[PDB]
Structures are given as structure tokens and as C-alpha cells.
Amino acid sequence: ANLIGREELQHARDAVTSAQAQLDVAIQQYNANQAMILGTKLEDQPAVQQ
């Protein structure tokens, strides 16, 4: 309806995109350190068997 400035909407879209990027970073941080805990059971982990 042409009420608010365009730089305000630009800054809103940029914020949403940045938040998406940060969530991707967090998900990736989780995916790593899940490669170590692949085995379901604690007694079957490679370190314990050694």
C-alpha cells in the first residue's frame, strides 16, 4: 500500500536471510559431533572397545 520506506523492508528481508544462515551454521555444528556418536549403544563405541 506504499506506507513505509523501502529501506525498512530491505532490512527486514536481509534479517530473515541472515537468521536462516545462522540456523544453517547451528545445524551443521550439530551434524558434526554426531559422526562420533553414530553407534547407538555406549558399550559398542570404538573408544570403549579398544
Binding site: 506504499n2 520506506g5 523501502r6 529501506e7 530491505q10
Partner: protein, 50 residues
Amino acid sequence: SFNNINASISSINAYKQAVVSAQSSLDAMEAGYSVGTRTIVDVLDATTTL
């Protein structure tokens, strides 16, 4: 009366300067809205002030 005349001259000068200042403010607002940094509401107020 002779003094009222000079008073009027001075007031004319002052209001001319005020008009120039309002013109400059309006132009700045219009350019900012053209590039997207301001809302249409801001432009309407500068036009009213001019």
C-alpha cells in the same frame, strides 16, 4: 508608520530564508524516498511544511 515599514522589510527577509530552508528539506526528503530510505508519509510532511 515609518518604523512599521522597516519592520515589514525585515520580516520579508526572514520568511524568504525560511522558504529556502523548507525547499531544501523537501528536496532531501524526496531524493531519500526515491532511493528507498524514507516512507511516503515523510514526503507528505515536508510538502506541508513548504
